[PDB]
Design a protein around this ligand. Sequence first.
Ligand code: A1AW2
Length: 209
Amino acid sequence: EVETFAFQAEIAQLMSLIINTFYSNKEIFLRELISNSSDALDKIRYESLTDPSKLDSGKELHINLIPNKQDRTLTIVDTGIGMTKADLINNLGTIAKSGTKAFMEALQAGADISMIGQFGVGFYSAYLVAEKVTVITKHNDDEQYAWESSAGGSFTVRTDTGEPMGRGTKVILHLKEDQTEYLEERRIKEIVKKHSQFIGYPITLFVEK
Ligand SMILES: Brc1ccc(CN2CCCNCC2)cc1
């Protein structure tokens, strides 16, 4: 049972700008997604300070980067607070409408796409490199859900029958054909060292057969 939703017009505009603007510095997508994971881990850590049972769904707080060249996917896994179904539908827990408004004003006023994270909509930088994005998520207060979009104005939400996650969020980037450098170990290491050196959680880059 799959529910299909329309993006708000402002978010559809944001994604089309990200997909269509000529902008070579695409590597910042990974910084933005790792930053989102760190924010989600901060949230469940804070909640656990007054209620230790919040970590009954998993005590480890970490970020995993999983490249798969056969599937041409890069997956970013975190054990943060996750998202409810309502969060997913509401622009994956962001204030994307007001954030997009501020971002596009800054772009005409000198800014570039790399500053997207300052406007709270860094998730959508995934479409710099991905033709399709799948988000699997589990929040303590809801069931496991799968969000998916290839842009084009719509996204889907369904209950996830796949591998149970415990708690957190999995962002699966189905990479564009010409963006497979982001599956190479040395390229991922370079980006993480350049942009994510002070993230306060272990980042593990998985290797392949
Ligand atoms: Br790939 C990769 C590259 C470098 C690190 C070093 N890290 C920085 C991120 C946060 N943990 C402290 C140490 C990790 C993964």
